[PDB]
Amino acid sequence: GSHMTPKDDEFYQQWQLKYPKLILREASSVSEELHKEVQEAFLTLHKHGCLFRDLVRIQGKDLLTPVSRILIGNPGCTYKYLNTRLFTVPWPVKTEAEIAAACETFLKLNDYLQIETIQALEELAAKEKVDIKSRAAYNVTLLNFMDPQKMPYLKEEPYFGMGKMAVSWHHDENLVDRSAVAVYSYSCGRDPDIWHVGFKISWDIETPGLAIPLHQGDCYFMLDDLNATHQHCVLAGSQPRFSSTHRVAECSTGTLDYILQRCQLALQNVCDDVDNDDVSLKSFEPAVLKQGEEIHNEVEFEWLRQFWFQGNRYRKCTDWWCQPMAQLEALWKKMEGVTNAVLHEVKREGLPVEQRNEILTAILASLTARQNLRREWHARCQSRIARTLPADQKPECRPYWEKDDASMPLPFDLTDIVSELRGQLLE
Numbered sequence: 178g179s180h181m182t183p184k185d186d187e188f189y190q191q192w193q194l195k196y197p198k199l200i201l202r203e204a205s206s207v208s209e210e211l212h213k214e215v216q217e218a219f220l221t222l223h224k225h226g227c228l229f230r231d232l233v234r235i236q237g238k239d240l241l242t243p244v245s246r247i248l249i250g251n252p253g254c255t256y257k258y259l260n261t262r263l264f265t266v267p268w269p270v271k272t273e274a275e276i277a278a279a280c281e282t283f284l285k286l287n288d289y290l291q292i293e294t295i296q297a298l299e300e301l302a303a304k305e306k307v308d309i310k311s312r313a314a315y316n317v318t319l320l321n322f323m324d325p326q327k328m329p330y331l332k333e334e335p336y337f338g339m340g341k342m343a344v345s346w347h348h349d350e351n352l353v354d355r356s357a358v359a360v361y362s363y364s365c366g367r368d369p370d371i372w373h374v375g376f377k378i379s380w381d382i383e384t385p386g387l388a389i390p391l392h393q394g395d396c397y398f399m400l401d402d403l404n405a406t407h408q409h410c411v412l413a414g415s416q417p418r419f420s421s422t423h424r425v426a427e428c429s430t431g432t433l434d435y436i437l438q439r440c441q442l443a444l445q446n447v448c449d450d451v452d453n454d455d456v457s458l459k460s461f462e463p464a465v466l467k468q469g470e471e472i473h474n475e476v477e478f479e480w481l482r483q484f485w486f487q488g489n490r491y492r493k494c495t496d497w498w499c500q501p502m503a504q505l506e507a508l509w510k511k512m513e514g515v516t517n518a519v520l521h522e523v524k525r526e527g528l529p530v531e532q533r534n535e536i537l538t539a540i541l542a543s544l545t546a547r548q549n550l551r552r553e554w555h556a557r558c559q560s561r562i563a564r565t566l567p568a569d570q571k572p573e574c575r576p577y578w579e580k581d582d583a584s585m586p587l588p589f590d591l592t593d594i595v596s597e598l599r600g601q602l603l604e
């Protein structure tokens with residue numbers, strides 16, 4: 178293998194003929210005003226300690242990101258990566274002081290970056306001689322920080338000899354299709370002291386990868402299918418680095434509006450005159466019961482457990498999600514009641530056996546899934562790393578109720594219940 182930088186003579190030709198979908202802008206193309214405004218936003222966020230490293234699950238394993246990070250952007254939005262749903266600390270489209278001003282700042286930056294992106298995608302679709310407008314509609318930014326020479330060893334980038342790296346080779350998952358990504362970098366063989374972003378064609382380690390030096394304020398853009406045709410990575414220097422990576426996320430199953438409406442659909446099968454521990458289900462068509470138990474699972478695990486695993490990231494940063502998340506927890510325990518209601522009806526004296534088997538076969542996949550996933554989550558909350566962390570770094574394991582708590586109709590452990598119903602059906 179090998180790699181190239183603006184030193185090498187064939188760099189510019191390799192870029193033109195094998196990486197053309199990538200664009201650079203030196204800090205020189207950006208306002209003075211904007212430059213120091215964003216840097217001051219960045220810094221006041223570091224002093225207040227909002228940048229958290231997240232505790233992730235990847236291929237069965239519980240790991241700790243060396244970069245610290247935070248997710249800002251559209252209110253009600255979420256962005257899922259490495260099995261972690263980051264929730265928006267919001268910026269002001271139509272909470273705590275001194276932080277509002279940085280979110281405002283990064284939104285101004287988002288508008289600027291939008292502008293430049295659309296110009297570039299114009300020129301590109303011009304070389305080709307609502308996709309454009311929406312592939313620039315950045316809805317969130319993932320900010321991230323790393324102080325090198327605090328890591329105890331950094332992985333040597335292994336296919337091209339690019340030296341130590343702070344982010345392995347990857348694509349930016351879960352973005353809308355052919356959407357660009359706009360980065361703002363902030364620094365302080367190839368040169369090891371200076372920060373670089375490195376690039377390579379996927380599956381490929383013959384074609385020499387590029388490694389672009391990024392000085393303070395340098396910006397770049399991954400356009401069209403670039404983010405899919407190539408993977409990238411971030412090579413470290415010696416000074417701490419910031420970067421703000423602005424993206425258009427697939428938030429079609431990941432907004433507070435969406436999960437709420439899902440809840441209303443589940444609850445439509447429920448007699449809603451009053452609200453008490455007294456759930457009487459409106460229908461028993463198997464399909465409806467199944468859709469209910471699925472929405473049960475979706476709000477429990479994609480929304481509750483996720484929110485509370487990033488234990489106190491949130492009520493430290495903003496309060497925005499509090500009333501929302503409280504509301505989601507309420508709807509979830511009413512769904513617990515719905516489930517207990519079905520569990521009652523299925524064993525009732527004088528229910529025809531064929532209906533019993535139909536209703537079982539409708540719900541059992543969702544019950545089994547709820548069981549397996551509560552197992553994973555209590556495991557992850559009592560992880561190697563988790564159960565021995567800073568006392569605030571610990572994730573919370575919510576919802577979790579004990580046996581004696583009668584406020585909850587059904588147990589937290591359902592293995593015997595799934596065993597029971599499966600032992601009915603296979604007879």
Ligand SMILES: O=C1O[C@H]([C@@H](O)CO)C(O)=C1O
Nearest residue numbers: 319321344349410411420422
């Ligand atoms: O520099 C980067 O920061 C983000 C981070 O989220 C890594 O997972 C990303 O995707 C990069 O390439």
Ligand SMILES: [Ga+3]
Nearest residue numbers: 347348349409
């Ligand atoms: Ga990336």
